[PDB]
Nucleic acid binder design. Structure first.
Lengths: 52, 75, 328
RNA sequence: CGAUCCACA
RNA sequence: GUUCGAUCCACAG
């Protein structure tokens, strides 16, 4: 899996950014259900981390 | 008689691979120095000035053609 | 080491006294949200899974758009930059399709090869490379070639190779990889593929996921907040940021939106190095996208000449009524 | 008549 | 690249 480093942006196969020291996540975004079964749910906690 | 070049190697996908300095057409017939049928051009690729060529060996054991200079034969 | 987009053209001034009326048109920045949408492009980060068309299809339904389209197809297993032009901006994808792209790839080799050799062979493939082998002809035929602007190998672990590649539109990375593998004997295939650039759109702050896009939109319809949804949508101008531009004067804008081709005298300023037949973006002096067209003259001819047709208008985007009819 | 905008092969 | 609508027929002084 192609990983991405959240700080440097740098692309890597490894679990630790060899340029920013940070832990890496997968580069691909997450799947999206088109009926978005749990959208009003995701929106509920989203509102409280943006101050909405 | 249009000299292709030396067979670099036999590729696992079952193709003789030659580096050359021109572009063979798909399905050109390929021969050795002693003039015998060896296979057909199935792919051309890489740098236009210096293409790789992929030949489908129409011969029993092809692994014996590495190092050998192959030729295309118009007629 | 970079795409052609990335090269900055020079701007030749033809009418140095040209000015623009603030009452006419709408700079992208100060567009009302609903209008912003009507002329927008989303720098979308597509998820592995769907076809590019399905993605757009969803966007249509969820935002209640009458139409939209995407700026270069991504295969279902592929993620990354997928520009989606909306509504009246939909056709701008035409300026994107030709545009250079950048990917990050994972090649899996079918046998073992030293790294020195993997690096060396991979640089054979920078430059003009052959796509489809020609067919037997009795006459000199056209040969299908695409340019690979750069291959940068990021890291190598074993049989697995991760590289960044910049290419000309119409270059299949799957195919590049197969060809490379063939050139290393053992063979290879494409493990993973992500698109990191499509012309002017890249992985930056404007790049948004399907989740955020829909969430921000609800934050506007339900919570009365327009700031987030607005940020998710770019001015269609962005889509046209890599093309050569002819900036016209206000006197000429409504003529173009009413179906006149752009004549030399309407020109205020232009990019240098426009060849006849090139794709050009015709812009307002406030940098609105008025239209796309084919150049009928060179930057030089446009600059020196005093009459004639500079650009054949092909697609018009700006509403007939933003600038007054000023001609005849 | 010709361009552009809109809908349908 | 072909069917009837809509706008215009515009060298931008």
């Amino acid at each position: 899996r192609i990983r991405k480093c959240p700080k440097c942006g740098r692309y890597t196969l490894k679990e630790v950014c060899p340029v920013c020291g940070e832990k890496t996540k997968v580069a691909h975004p997450p799947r999206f259900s088109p009926e978005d079964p749990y959208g009003e749910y995701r929106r509920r906690w989203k509102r409280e981390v943006l101050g909405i | 008689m249009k000299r292709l070049g030396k067979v670099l190697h036999y590729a696992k996908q079952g193709f003789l691979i030659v580096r050359t300095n021109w572009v063979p057409s798909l399905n050109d017939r390929v021969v050795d120095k002693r003039l015998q049928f060896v296979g057909i051009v199935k792919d051309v690729f890489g740098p236009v000035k210096m293409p790789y060529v992929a030949i489908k060996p129409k011969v029993s054991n092809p692994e014996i053609y590495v190092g050998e200079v192959l030729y295309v034969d118009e007629r | 080491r970079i795409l052609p987009a990335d090269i900055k053209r020079e701007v030749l001034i033809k009418d140095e006294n040209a000015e623009t009326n603030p009452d006419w048109g709408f700079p992208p920045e100060k567009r009302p949200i609903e209008m912003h949408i009507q002329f927008g492009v989303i720098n979308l980060d597509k998820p592995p899974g769907p076809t590019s068309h399905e993605v757009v299809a969803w966007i249509k339904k969820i935002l209640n758009l009458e139409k939209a389209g995407h700026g270069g197809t991504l295969d279902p297993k592929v993620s990354g930059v997928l520009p989606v032009a909306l509504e009246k901006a939909t056709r701008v994808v035409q300026a994107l399709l030709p545009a250079g792209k950048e990917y990050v790839a994972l090649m899996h080799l079918h046998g073992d090869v030293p790294e020195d050799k993997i690096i060396q062979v991979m640089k054979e493939f920078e430059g003009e490379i052959i796509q489809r082998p020609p067919l037997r002809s009795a006459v000199k035929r056209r040969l299908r070639t695409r340019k690979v602007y750069y291959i940068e190998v990021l890291e190598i672990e074993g049989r697995d190779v991760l590289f960044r590649v910049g290419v000309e539109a119409g270059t299949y990375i799957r195919s590049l990889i197969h060809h490379i593998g063939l050139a290393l004997g053992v063979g290879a295939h494409m493990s993973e593929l992500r698109r990191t650039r499509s012309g002017p759109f890249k992985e930056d702050e404007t790049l948004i996921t399907l989740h955020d896009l829909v969430d921000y939109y609800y934050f506007w319809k339900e919570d009365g907040i327009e700031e987030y949804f607005r940020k998710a949508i770019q001015p269609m101008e962005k889509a046209v940021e890599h093309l050569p531009k002819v900036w016209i004067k206000d006197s000429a804008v409504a003529a173009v939106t009413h179906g006149a081709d752009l004549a030399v005298p309407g020109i205020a300023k232009l990019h240098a190095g426009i060849k006849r037949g090139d794709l050009v973006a015709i812009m307002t002096l406030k940098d609105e996208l008025v239209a796309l067209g084919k150049a009928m003259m060179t930057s030089q001819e446009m600059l020196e000449k005093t009459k004639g047709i500079a650009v054949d208008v092909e697609k018009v985007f700006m509403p007939r009524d933003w600038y007054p009819k000023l001609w005849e």
